[PDB]
């Protein structure tokens, strides 16, 4: 980075967005089954291979 391509920025941006906890009201829905965000992700725990 520093000087990145718009493709990579985009990818990085989409990744920012997916990186939030389970929105706690899903937990309330009928038959809801999701306890937490299983596909979460940390910058120093898992590199996103571009």
């Amino acid at each position: 980075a520093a000087q990145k391509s718009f493709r990579i920025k985009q990818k990085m941006a989409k990744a920012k967005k997916q990186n939030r906890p389970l929105p706690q009201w899903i937990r309330l829905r009928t038959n809801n089954t999701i306890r937490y965000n299983a596909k979460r992700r940390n910058w120093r725990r898992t590199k996103m291979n571009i």
């Binding site: 920025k9 989409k14 967005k17």
Partner: peptide, 11 residues
């Protein structure tokens, strides 16, 4: 007058 633009980090 003039129009600066930028891409936010949430795309």
């Amino acid at each position: 007058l003039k129009v600066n633009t930028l891409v936010r980090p949430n795309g």
